[PDB]
């Protein structure tokens, strides 16, 4: 038996079974809220349905004619089932008038804490705000230094900059796009207070070694897990874990929201206080901290969150199926040394699907795929943090050289992958990818 | 001929006309979105309805016996008609998948811009965020001093403190609870860069004099108008006007939102950039400012705002009626010398109703209305900015004494006032207040 908890490791186990590679594995599903859709869709009397065809039942394969591919059409991220359920919960929340704090905010924090196996959760107004509050709660002061990679979304460095701290950029691992633990200790000075690893594209960093370093220098760890919800054993070594529930993440609400996650009650208390004006917990208009933000989640978005999180494990399952299909159908382009593919691992939730186009062919392939084959691809993110055309960069990061980050930035390309894409759509992408690499 | 544009002055004129003070005045209504409910309820064929009974048609007065009064029951602040329209609009927005930016954000900014007669509006994720971003856009750096009053909600000073600037408190005048223009000049230094007047409780500060002072020293003015939507001529003299649409304000959404309002195109662009990660507008992932926040309004809350703002002018008219009835019915306590009441003025939108309990009986009155008469009263706000139990206040605001502010703080008490309260409920408050002073 394996008991599907809704995390990446179990989903990868379930996928190989749904394709039949299992050894008569008894699967059962935990009835937690992130499994709600999966349990309705694939299970029947707490056992896998006998009659599951992935292509027909899960992806609705019907040989539809495809003429163009967009990378992330927003209208396909939400399903009619989601919408009907959201309307239902809004009709319950709206009459209450509780539109700031509320019971749905607290229910979502309980759900997230259970899902992540962490004691304390502060649901926030965005992942960016969660990070800012979290930096403040560990005691970050203006001029303090925060070690971080240079290839994240701008929010990561912005949270550090917004409170007057100093990003110190460290090179990545070319094997995982994650910050390299072997280069972290070199960057530690008297001014560093925090290491800020990013679980980029849905894959986790090598957190075990970072913790060992963090303990020797007595540094805090705040993990940017804004793209990594559902990854197994997420946050085992972190002081604080940051989540984002923006509508584009593996799990989103209908608007902006995020969360702070921790087992450390002292940090949890300060985060709750900083996220709401410095007021003592649930003592509005009475400050104990010097200041704070207006950064807790909306009760209404928490209620939408509790409806949409029902689809999380199922949508992550569709994501891992799509990623494996890309890997298996592009392998010969890798054997020809034209591209490098990601490897299937049990922690990746496949928020984004990166490949590397080597021999300097990335720009030609991206541009031809769009201009010739009507296929959008994207580069997350087009500019590295030490390379923005800002006054901050020109004064502080001109001499920054991040060898692996910069090299892989010239090769990276992200392929369309979202849980409601058709297999005919992925076929379109796959054939363009193959045709342009003849 | 009086043209009702949905603002303060005309509402006071209309109220005088709707009562026995009419002067055969002809009223017309402008079909703007904030007038929607007003026009539907009080007008017919584009003329004022003939036999409007304020108590019976607007408040449904039936002498229902009341046993208890809550200060601000959140369930009573939103109507079923609003809920219906919200459900209706969300069935249209939700299928678009457009949950961050979107067309409703843009429409709400046009609507607010028209209503305030200002060229540029950036809809934000909160009033607090709007204030922080505006301060950034005028160039506030760490160390710049911001002249404020000390009697505002924490957010006003928190926005200054959050970006490293230093608030410079200035006393109020005893007449309006607003910053005393007489004392602005006293506090101006080489380091002052902005004056931050607060239109507290819905009453406008004497802005014409503040503009005079600010121009002598070439200072920007940022108006915290988070309590004052609908006040006539709002922002005539300020560089930027901060609005809040939090759900307990005269107009609110069903979550957090705000707006930045300006005629200055250069500030609006910077506000737009600081509002979304420092990115150039419509060119994401390419930064032009050093950093930014994630603080634009959610498209979903903008759709909601466009539904709820239909009630604003009508809900402000119920507020003024309530205010006047408290005034006329409590003056027996004013003539006695036990209390002091606000004066009806054309600019007050009556977000809160303040009175002053004289000669040190405020605490006993407040506590006996609750234990003896089950009447909730509240103090907005319980702690002054310079007296909080924070490390800031003792290290910073220890020699700081603000005479009229602190003395008024011992007298102040707010009476329940919200546009859906019953007159039976207000009469219950009035009998408790007279009884407790017999
Ligand atoms: C999206 C994202 C963020 C910010 O999350 P928001 O909820 O949009 O503010 C931070 N870090 C990473 C890696 C992200 O992908
Ligand atoms: C409510 C309020 C704020 C903050 O507004 P939010 O939208 O809640 O962030 C700021 N100033 C005053 C005077 C307020 O009443
Ligand atoms: O912060 C809040 O939720 C309340 C502010 C608005 C008000 O009640 O005056």
Description:
The structure is a homodimer of 438-residue chains. Chain A is 37% helix and 11% strand. In chain A, strands 3-9-8-7-6-4-5 form a seven-stranded mixed β-sheet, sandwiched between helices. In chain A, strands 10-11-12 form a three-stranded antiparallel β-sheet. A two-stranded parallel ribbon of chain A has the order 1-2. Chain A has a domain of 125 residues: Aspartate Aminotransferase, domain 1 (Alpha-Beta Complex), CATH 3.90.1150.10. Chain A starts with a strand and ends with a helix. Chain A is α/β, with parallel strands linked by helices and 438 residues long. Chains A and B meet through helix 4, helix 6, helix 7 and helix 10 of A and helix 4, helix 6, helix 7, strand 13 and helix 10 of B.
Ordered list of secondary-structure elements with their pairings:
2 copies of one chain form a homodimer.
Chain A lengths: L1 E3 L3 H11 L8 E3 L6 H7 L11 H5 L21 H14 L9 H14 L3 E5 L2 H11 L7 E4 L5 H9 L3 E4 L22 E4 L11 H10 L3 E5 L15 E5 L13 E5 L2 H10 L24 H10 L3 H24 L3 E2 L12 E5 L4 H10 L19 H6 L6 H7 L2 E4 L7 H14 L2
Parallel strand pairs in A: 1-2, 4-5, 4-6, 6-7, 7-8
Antiparallel strand pairs in A: 3-9, 8-9, 10-11, 11-12
Helix pairs in contact in A: 1-11, 2-11, 4-10, 5-10, 6-7, 6-9, 11-15
Bound molecules: the ligand *Cc1c(COP(=O)(O)O)cnc(C)c1O (2 copies) and glutaric acid.
The site of one copy of the ligand *Cc1c(COP(=O)(O)O)cnc(C)c1O has 15 residues of chain A, from helix 6 and helix 7.
């Amino acid at each position: 038996l394996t008991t599907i908890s809704g995390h990446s490791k179990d989903n990868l186990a379930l996928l190989k079974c749904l394709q039949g590679e299992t050894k008569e594995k008894e699967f059962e599903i935990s009835n937690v809220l992130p499994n709600h859709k999966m349990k309705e869709k694939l299970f029947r009397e707490n056992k896998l349905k006998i009659d599951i065809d992935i292509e027909k039942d899960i992806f609705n394969y019907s040989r539809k004619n495809i003429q163009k591919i967009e990378f992330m059409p927003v209208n396909r991220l939400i399903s009619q089932s989601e919408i009907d359920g959201i309307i239902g919960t809004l009709k319950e929340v709206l009459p209450t008038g509780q539109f700031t704090s509320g019971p749905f905010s607290k229910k979502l924090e309980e759900v997230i804490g259970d899902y992540l196996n962490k004691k304390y959760v502060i649901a926030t107004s965005s992942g960016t705000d969660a990070l800012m509050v979290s930096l403040l709660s560990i005691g970050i002061q203006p001029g303090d230094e925060v070690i971080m990679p240079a290839n994240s979304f701008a929010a990561t460095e912005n949270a550090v900059l917004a409170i007057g701290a100093k990003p110190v950029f460290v090179d990545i691992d070319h094997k995982s796009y994650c910050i390299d633990p072997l280069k972290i200790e070199e960057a530690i000075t008297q001014k560093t207070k925090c290491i800020l690893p990013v679980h980029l594209y849905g894959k986790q960093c090598d957190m075990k070694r970072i913790r060992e370093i963090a303990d020797v220098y007595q540094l805090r760890i705040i993990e940017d897990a804004c793209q990594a919800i559902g990854s197994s054993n997420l946050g085992e070594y972190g002081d604080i874990i940051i989540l984002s529930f923006n509508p584009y993440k593996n799990f989103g609400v209908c608007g902006k929201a995020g969360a702070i996650v921790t087992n450390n009650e002292n940090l949890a208390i300060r985060c709750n206080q900083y996220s709401y004006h410095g007021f003592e917990v649930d003592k509005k208009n009475k400050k104990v901290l010097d200041f704070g933000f207006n950064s807790k989640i909306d009760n209404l978005q928490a209620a939408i969150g509790l409806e949409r999180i029902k689809f999380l494990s199922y949508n992550n399952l569709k994501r891992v199926f799509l990623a494996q299909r890309y890997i298996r159908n592009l392998k010969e382009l890798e054997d020809r040394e034209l591209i490098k593919l990601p490897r299937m691992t049990e922690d990746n939730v496949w928020h984004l699907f990166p490949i590397r186009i080597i021999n300097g062919r990335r720009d030609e392939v991206k541009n031809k795929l769009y201009q010739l084959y009507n296929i959008e691809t994207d580069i997350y993110y087009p500019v590295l943090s030490h390379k923005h055309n800002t006054k901050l960069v020109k004064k502080n990061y001109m001499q920054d050289t991040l060898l692996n980050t910069e090299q892989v930035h010239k090769e990276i390309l992200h392929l369309p992958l979202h849980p409601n894409m058709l297999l005919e759509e992925q076929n379109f992408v796959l054939e363009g990818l193959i045709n342009v690499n003849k």
